[PDB]
Design a protein around this ligand. Structure first.
Ligand SMILES: [Cl-]
Ligand SMILES: [Cl-]
Ligand SMILES: [Cl-]
Ligand SMILES: [Cl-]
Ligand SMILES: [Cl-]
Ligand SMILES: [Cl-]
Ligand SMILES: [Cl-]
Ligand SMILES: [Cl-]
Ligand code: NA
Length: 129
């Protein structure tokens, strides 16, 4: 599923991500935009053989099981495939554990490089929330 901007903002809020660990809704929408262009089925292979999955590009090295990343962990206790669903629950619950890990939203390299410090409120501007 490819979400619209305000549509994803609404789903993220419903699942309790708005201000989670102090990060406003706009930061989460901005991260989704540059990680997946709002497409739940996005995937991207890393140089190390791991793979990033879903709207927030969660990596198989630590967070989900794909059966093909040697010596990895599955800290979210899920198959990486659950991260590609039209329903975002699995992605949001796993993102909650990632953003709690010590480095905040810097865990997402695209948020640091493209969203951090910017006018992130622009991502939710005009949305009926
Ligand atoms: Cl957009
Ligand atoms: Cl915001
Ligand atoms: Cl594996
Ligand atoms: Cl394969
Ligand atoms: Cl594990
Ligand atoms: Cl599994
Ligand atoms: Cl949803
Ligand atoms: Cl923080
Ligand atoms: Na894994």
């Amino acid at each position: 599923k490819v979400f619209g901007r305000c549509e994803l903002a609404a789903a993220m809020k419903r699942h309790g991500l708005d201000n989670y660990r102090g990060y406003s809704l706009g930061n989460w929408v901005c991260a989704a935009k540059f990680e997946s262009n709002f497409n739940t089925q996005a995937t991207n292979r890393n140089t190390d053989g791991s793979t990033d999955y879903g709207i927030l590009q969660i990596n198989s090295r630590w967070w989900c099981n794909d059966g093909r990343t040697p010596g990895s962990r599955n800290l979210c206790n899920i198959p990486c495939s659950a991260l590609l669903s039209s329903d975002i629950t699995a992605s949001v619950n796993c993102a909650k554990k990632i953003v709690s890990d010590g480095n905040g939203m810097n865990a997402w390299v695209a948020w640091r490089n493209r969203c951090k410090g910017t006018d992130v409120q622009a991502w939710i501007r005009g949305c009926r929330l």
